[PDB]
Ligand binder design. Sequence first.
Ligand SMILES: CSc1ccccc1CC(=O)N1CCO[C@H](C(N)=O)C1
Ligand SMILES: [Zn+2]
Length: 140
Amino acid sequence: SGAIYVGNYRVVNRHLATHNDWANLVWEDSSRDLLVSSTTAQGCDTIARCDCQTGVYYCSSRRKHYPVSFSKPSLIFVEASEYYPARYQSHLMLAVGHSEPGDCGGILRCQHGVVGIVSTGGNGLVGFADVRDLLWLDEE
Ligand SMILES: CSc1ccccc1CC(=O)N1CCO[C@H](C(N)=O)C1
Ligand SMILES: [Zn+2]
């Protein structure tokens, strides 16, 4: 679990969006596993606006922050699960690292801020849903 809090927005994995989130929807994209909901209180996360391919992610299943090299956002095939049928997920970045289902929501960060959140994994890999292209997150 985990979320990004920037301005009056809460960014979470779409598959983990609570009942309170859909009743306050701003934007969602199933093909990106992302959902953004409005918040009453202002958040303090800064979104990165860069093309960094190295960063640090939080892994809840190990209670540890790991440094990683990650690929550029891409259209990647993601195996069927209890949340989605087998499909291509867009704006996905992969890294060699540990992850388990309960790890989605963990933040990936570089020297410029929040890059994205854990969204996929398996086989000694971890996938992150990129948020750096969502320029509107900086304004309202
Ligand atoms: C850190 S996720 C993980 C890790 C190890 C093994 C398996 C998983 C689960 C996983 O990859 N998915 C289930 C939830 O929906 C995801 C999606 N964005 O389509 C995909
Ligand atoms: Zn950066």
